Amino acid sequence: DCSIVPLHHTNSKGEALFLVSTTDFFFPSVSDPFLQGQIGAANVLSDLYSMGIPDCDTMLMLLAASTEMDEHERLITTREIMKGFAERARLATTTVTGGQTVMNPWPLIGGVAMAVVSEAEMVRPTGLLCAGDILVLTKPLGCQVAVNLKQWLLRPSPLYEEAIAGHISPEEIEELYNMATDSMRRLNREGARLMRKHGAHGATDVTGFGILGHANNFGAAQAVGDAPRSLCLVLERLPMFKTAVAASKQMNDKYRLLEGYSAETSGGLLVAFPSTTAAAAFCAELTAVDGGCPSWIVGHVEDRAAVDGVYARLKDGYEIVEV
Amino acid sequence: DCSIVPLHHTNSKGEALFLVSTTDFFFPSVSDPFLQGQIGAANVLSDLYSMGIPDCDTMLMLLAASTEMDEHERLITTREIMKGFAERARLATTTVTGGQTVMNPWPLIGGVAMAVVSEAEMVRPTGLLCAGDILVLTKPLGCQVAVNLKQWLLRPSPLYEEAIAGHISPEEIEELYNMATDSMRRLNREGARLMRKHGAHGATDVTGFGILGHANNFGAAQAVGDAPRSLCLVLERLPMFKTAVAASKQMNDKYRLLEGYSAETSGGLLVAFPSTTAAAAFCAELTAVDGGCPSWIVGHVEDRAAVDGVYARLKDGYEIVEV
């Protein structure tokens, strides 16, 4: 979800230009600060990528530096976050050209991403979605579980000893956490670049509301305003980190992963296509150019019957695709 | 100070386009929340106006809502800040099209302002400034003093009773505070609109570093990078709220108003012109279109001799223009 603003300028051919901007933030764990920065930047860019815009013109970095650390610790942490944020901006072929850092009792890492585009250079997230369309997800789910288990290694909770220790090893937790953070810092840029090519009908990114929450918002957005559609996103199968699923079952689905509401940070794109043929071709080209990272067809869009505010559903007995 | 980013688009005539963006924030006092919002927005726009860009394409609002207040108080405060912020955006002929609100122990009100412009639609803040140029300031100084005296009426400090009470009345303090907040919520938009018309050589806005701090940064900026100039901004006379000056003298210049380092929020533009004739014409047209708000010629630019990092100075025995 971005802001899309018509400008009082056209391009060289007299075509309308638009300023597309987005902002986001995340609360980092006590962890590798360079990595925090990378995830912070990928999270900001993710929203722009969901508009089918692979080229970001510039970024602003917004950072809250914690008053808890001593000067030495705070200085190196801030420096490393900045470096990691900038490293992802370089990978995105953009630059960080401004922003601000403030002292604050709680840390925060976020920013703003902006692109100036013509209509031909984006894919609008409303107005294209139809019943029958096929849904694909470009990153696996379960990062909230991953981050919390890793946290418990350095600063344990009673739940860790009660339900986790002895059943899921520090090595399996290390591997889950590495898979999750590797996935989180990855850009959705290649996905954005391929959306138009395969006739995508729009996308949303998956962040703090979980797969089902963001699916719901994507569906609900089609019901505003002047030319509404009444649609329901049906999730039939979902890619989830295997160890995150195992951990969830040991903790009575504490983080609501299996319910569809577990928070992701810098999650994947949930993209719609007009057919399975189109969706499969997008997935095939995406894995081939983006380092062999799989994507998954996860369901379809149907006509909405229905309960107020409900525009997405998890199918009863949906398939879990263990990753 | 903004970010100015060349875009891979031209306008209808094949002229280069640039994305100019800026961000800023302020820590609001316990006060009228609608007014907090208005000052917050004017503060964000001020930086864009300093680039001679009177038309803002869009704004994002970034707000930190305090965890200190109870739900009822927080909800109405947040609502009123939002309304005040939006009211100034309407006055600026722009819209707030996105942003974010976060819970936080400390309140903050800020945002982002963006414009897409050609070279002909802005005035760059480096590269035009010359020795001999005349400096003008478009809002009076002393808001930090004003805000703190008003604060002491509802939540007193020992300094208030020691040095203020009995010498500066609650009515004089009310008047100083009203003058200061009236000035702070005013947009620098008309100033921006008139800069090019009179051949301005760039501007900076005046915010948290005080008149001398921002003058210094404006001068120092000319020394980077490929085509540097060595210049010194000389401040010869300064407009200051009369009561703020009186209060300063009672408190041994506590807030450094007389030293030139008192923090302003949403202060005026410090603008350079090639001559006194040009400067006077700008001032005359600005007061005529912007509700009769005075502006002042405050000094000039000279060749820099000098101490490292020093690119501005207050003249010994400079004139205080009481407002």
Numbering used by the authors:
A (entry chain A), B (entry chain A): 6 to 310, 313 to 330
What did the article's authors report about this structure?
We determined the crystal structure of an N-terminally truncated selenophosphate synthetase from L. major (ΔN-LmSEPHS2) consisting of an AIRS-like fold also conserved in E. coli, A. aeolicus and H. sapiens orthologs. ΔN-LmSEPHS2 crystallized as a monomer in the asymmetric unit showing a typical aminoimidazole ribonucleotide synthetase (AIRS)-like fold, which consists of two α+β domains labeled N- and C-terminal AIRS (AIRS and AIRS_C, respectively) ranging from amino acid residues 74 to 190 and 204 to 384, respectively. The N-terminal AIRS domain folds into a six-stranded β-sheet flanked by two α-helices and one 310-helix, while the AIRS_C domain also presents a six-stranded β-sheet that is flanked by seven α-helices and one 310-helix. Similarly, the apo ΔN-LmSEPHS2 crystal structure lacks a 69-amino acid residues-long N-terminal region that includes a glycine-rich loop, where the conserved catalytic residues Cys46 and Lys49 are located. An elongated dimer model of ΔN-LmSEPHS2 was generated using PDBePISA as a likely quaternary structure, stable in solution with a 3230 Å2 buried surface. The dimerization surface occurs mainly between the β2 and β5 strands of adjacent monomers and is also stabilized by hydrophobic interactions between side chains, leading to the formation of an eight-stranded β-barrel. The dimeric structure of ΔN-LmSEPHS2 conserves two symmetrically arranged ATP-binding sites, formed along the interface between AIRS and AIRS-C domains in each monomer. Our dimeric model of LmSEPHS2 contains two equivalent unbound active sites in an open conformation prior to ATP and metal binding, similar to what is observed in the apo E. coli and A. aeolicus SEPHS structures. We showed that the crystallized construct (ΔN-LmSEPHS2) does not complement selenoprotein biosynthesis in SEPHS deficient E. coli WL400(DE3) strain, as expected due to the lack of catalytic residues.
